[PDB]
Design a binder for this molecule. Structure first.
Ligand SMILES: [Cl-]
Ligand SMILES: [Cl-]
Ligand SMILES: [Cl-]
Ligand SMILES: [Cl-]
Ligand SMILES: [Cl-]
Ligand SMILES: [Cl-]
Ligand SMILES: [Cl-]
Ligand SMILES: [Cl-]
Ligand SMILES: [Cl-]
Ligand SMILES: [Cl-]
Ligand SMILES: [Cl-]
Ligand SMILES: [Cl-]
Ligand SMILES: [Cl-]
Lengths: 304, 303, 303, 303
């Protein structure tokens, strides 16, 4: 086929969120894959009948684009190599360890006329798109993402950039207007691990209330939009509730809608490829790749 | 019995929230009732076999205490008459139209050694008390009270002290620590009617996010408490949800639990009577009667 | 007032399901009440400012109608006394200990030109009426009534005619067509206490599956109607669910709808009085009073 | 690897329910696939980097086992060919168009020492297994499978064998004791298409109520087990509800549990392979492959 794709990084995220969709290779040729651990590389590639490659460079030279699912700290150096070898790059969030590094990569991509897209899957979550499209005259939005036994020994800034970024990015995508921080809770363990974080993001027309508790009673995600005559909620990316006219209407995801379709991974990955096919840029480009991260760096830097 | 009770105001609130409880008069004598419309007064009194009285003063002279369910604007003048006649008073929120008037009434009640209690029923809502009792190491609380087609043709300030006051009072009762306003949204119609209001009330240990949308998709009230290892929610004062260990547990109010018991009206009314019997003040006394309203006046003054 | 009403039997059901309605005596004069236990009689009457009476007969002579809430075995001779004294009678289910005794009472009421009504409140449950009214082209109905720790040390037949009768009556009311019983499950303890009962009631156009588990994991009731393009459910008489077009829509009872209104007690009691006022027979009259009981007698006799 | 697997039939079921799991070929070599339409064959094989084969026979000769996802009417002829070529066979339900044919195929598999397994995935549904394993002293089971706009332009017997068979198979698996039909509803269109079917299956200890409405308000599947002190329900194979001690606990499938794991397809497919690896017959073999179909044939013949 026209488009040749490779994958770099065959870790748990690649295995559960990307491989299951991309290995049904309908709109591209799956040229090969690389991961540093040779044993794991050969086993995964064998399972899917994909050609294993011995390096980032050898794979990139045979591809038009790469799905990169490596650790955040390796993004900057790997993406610089890939862009210089002329391949489009899809990478999991965040783009790079710092926004400054991200800005450098963005400029390199535009110089090379290549798409550098960050995997904010929630922007492609079908039910999130539905409530966004159907909301008019919004008065408030609430977004939360809580975890069960999710309290670990990593500094809070890592957790913010790695996970809270999804909450902030979804907020900014829904706001579709400039916002300012008007409230913050940030609770840390004695050893500086994240317990709870919350913000109020104020826009001209409404505010967004974002919240993440790492030591909650369940793993939950919810977006709730309050608008004229209506409440819309999407729970765990896959149940849609609408309160209107004094009734609560509940819609489930279809019985045969796979979980990657539900969460937006299917559509975001296919969109990345489609944009290459049609010589256009995905909406997640440029400042869109780093605006949530920029806000988080400001929050992180305000911590005395 | 030892305690003689009378009721002033026999309108919708009295009929739905108080009379269904107080007319089964187990702990007091229901001496009589008054409301200005004579036909309505005699009809409601006849319905319940209660003696109708022709004035506030005539009724008060025969009672030890009065349940007052009149319009907010009439609270100040009526309560002054009642306290000066030596009767304890229970009144629906808010105490009076202004905090100043409330302060005056509180002072008068202290001078006369009488109980003046404001009807913040949510502090006696059984499920609210349950979640408050069982939460430890709280990180956040969210409280909302939304309405369907509930835009009112009155200035926003009236709607805040009449209705949002429940949200604010419940927040302060749950906080059990000082709080500061750290965020606000106040959206009004062109005629200055309330559409939406929200605040963040920040305490040292956690914050409370409050909200009220008057033009929502349903009538709903919810308190949600996020604490270490747990989420607790009470919906419409009568369904309790707990999320713990990755599962959700749902408890309904018992099949024969009456709605006034569910909402706290039964317990708050009984508590008022019990405090008279025991010669003590209810917890909703003094500054507790007006602390939520004080916060609302700061909001109103800022517009 | 034109209509004089009295109440006989002031037990737990009278206290929770009838007195809270009837003591707001809008459409009738509450003349008095009698119950065999004098101490209880006087306490309850004092609480509601009702006149206590010394006997069934002394009360009946001062009334046009009586709400009777006595034990099933006492219904027959009491009702005979009341109808012979010219009083309309509302009674809790079942009418009498046996269907042939009920048939006699019905004929006596006819001879005396009086109404004799049995308290099948579910026929007046607002949400049950709503789903009945909106269902067309029904293919199946499921009705269940389960209890938590509801095993009682009484013979199964008593539980069937005192509680399962509500399930059967609701089924027959929803069927509105002849049905034939089949597919019986009847599980009893060694001591012959009811554990579980179920039936399939087959009509020409659809069947109704009825069940009742007395040692379940919760107290619940549900009516579910499957029809063309639709599922309707009412849970615990107060939540209405509709599945149509691939969506579930849930409607709760209004925030101020009292539980007796929810369950049909309010409307059934008011219906009894209205029918007296307008000189007509209530919905539940004649064979409607005993049709469910007749089916249960056939069931009990087949064991 | 040791086990060589091929797939015959690359239609909608293969694509949604099998290929997504089997193409991650961890425990076998995916040797190739065949489907009659060459264009579709080459597209799907290209998508997954699998070798396309031009016939059933050429593929079978290179495999140890075959997953067969062809139309019911072709099962008998294809399965005879495969068993005679020495390949183990996994096929979607039902085994063949008739029980006579199925019995022949089973006997043929025994003669050739090969496994012939029918794809009753619900027996491997994790939540179904959980409730089955946790139920004791069952008093009743209800199973339904309803559809939205699911009326099919085929005779009812086809729909019973193709779809209601899941309901009946799950019932017999949960019963684990002999049952007798104690009730039946069967409603058809003028052209003899299935609208609604229901049965009561009576066992010594409890009954199972099965139903399927093809013109309902939503697509729904539910298994509910009533037992001593407990109600357990599994909805759409992926939400578990337990009612116990008067409260309802709800457990969702894990956020990263894929839908084929949820529905039992993953586990049934892996079990088929594991049994080949261990020289054992899988759970669903012999009479288990046709037990549900046998009951349906009796139902169909009784019409
Ligand atoms: Cl690796
Ligand atoms: Cl689907
Ligand atoms: Cl976008
Ligand atoms: Cl008045
Ligand atoms: Cl109760
Ligand atoms: Cl009530
Ligand atoms: Cl008594
Ligand atoms: Cl209401
Ligand atoms: Cl009727
Ligand atoms: Cl084909
Ligand atoms: Cl279980
Ligand atoms: Cl998971
Ligand atoms: Cl999936």
């Amino acid at each position: 086929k026209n488009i040749k794709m490779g994958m770099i990084g065959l870790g748990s995220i690649a295995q559960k969120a990307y491989l299951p969709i991309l290995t049904k290779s309908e709109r591209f040729e799956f040229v090969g894959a690389f991961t540093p651990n040779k044993v794991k590389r050969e086993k995964i590639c064998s399972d899917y009948r994909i050609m294993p490659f011995d390096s980032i460079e050898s794979l990139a030279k045979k591809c038009d684009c790469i799905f990169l699912h490596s650790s955040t700290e390796t993004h900057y150096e790997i993406i610089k190599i890939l862009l210089n070898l002329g391949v489009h790059v899809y990478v999991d969030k965040p783009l790079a360890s710092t926004v400054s590094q991200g800005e450098e990569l963005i400029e390199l991509s535009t110089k090379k006329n290549l798409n550098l897209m960050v995997g904010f899957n929630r922007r492609f979550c079908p039910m999130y798109k539905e409530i966004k499209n159907n909301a008019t005259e919004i008065v408030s939005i609430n977004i939360c993402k809580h975890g069960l036994n999710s309290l670990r020994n990593v500094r809070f800034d890592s957790t913010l950039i790695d996970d809270y970024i999804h909450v902030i990015d979804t907020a900014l995508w829904l706001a579709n207007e400039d916002v300012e921080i008007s409230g913050e809770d940030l609770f840390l363990t004695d050893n500086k691990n994240l317990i709870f974080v919350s913000h109020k993001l104020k826009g001209k027309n409404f505010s967004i209330n974002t919240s993440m508790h790492r030591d909650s009673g369940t793993k939950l995600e919810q977006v709730e939009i309050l608008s004229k005559g209506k409440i819309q909620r999407v729970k765990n990316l896959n149940v849609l509730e609408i309160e209107e006219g004094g009734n609560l209407t509940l819609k489930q995801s279809g019985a045969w809608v796979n979980i990657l379709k539900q969460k937006g991974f299917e559509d975001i990955s296919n969109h990345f490829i489609d944009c290459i096919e049609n010589n256009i840029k995905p909406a997640i480009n440029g400042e869109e790749c780093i605006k949530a991260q920029r806000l988080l760096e400001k929050i992180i830097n305000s911590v005395k």
